Amino acid sequence: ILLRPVDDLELTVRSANCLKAEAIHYIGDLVQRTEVELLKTPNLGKKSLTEIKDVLASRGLSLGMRLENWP
Amino acid sequence: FGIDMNTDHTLEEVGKQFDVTRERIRQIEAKALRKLRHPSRSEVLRSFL
DNA sequence: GCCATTTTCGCGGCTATTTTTTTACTCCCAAAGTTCCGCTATCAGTTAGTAAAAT
RNA sequence: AAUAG
């Protein structure tokens, strides 16, 4: 799951484009940032973050999980 | 595409289903193909190529 | 009209594996149906652009 | 046809 790219998350066009603009390439990268990075992402709206956290809740993960030895 | 049917159909009679709209049927077909092209639900069908 | 003799008819084991065959030969013409290239024209699909909507 | 059983 962690090694899977963000393109497996079924994100919207704007959400995927914003995450690519932030150069997030893997799920582990995204789940290591919380709102500290995502809410400050340019062009990333308020409803977008709600959608992302709903998706992660569907996948059983959350934001800002602390993982060692990544990558 | 004619799946589970005797004949294939063009956009006109597919629109004839509920809303006769070629531009709409074309958009929904494109959306369906885009969702089926997502790697989350296409690894099963990828093995048949 | 039955007793014998001659004439057809059908038969002669099961599994494998190596590998083609070959003569013989008019012509022309007019009439008819078919094909192949090129062009037209229509419809449907695809794609580019722009406005509508949402963040 | 030839060959093996």
UniProtKB/TrEMBL annotation, chain B:
Subcellular location: Cytoplasm
RNA polymerase sigma-70 domain ranges (all copies): 10-36
Chain positions covered by the region annotation Sigma-70 factor domain-4: 1-38
DNA-binding region: 11-30
Family: Belongs to the sigma-70 factor family. RpoD/SigA subfamily.
Function according to Swiss-Prot or TrEMBL: Sigma factors are initiation factors that promote the attachment of RNA polymerase to specific initiation sites and are then released. This sigma factor is the primary sigma factor during exponential growth.
Quaternary structure and partners: Interacts transiently with the RNA polymerase catalytic core.
Protein name: RNA polymerase sigma factor RpoD
Organism: Vibrio cholerae serotype O1 (strain ATCC 39541 / Classical Ogawa 395 / O395)
Residue span relative to the full protein: 571 to 619 of 621
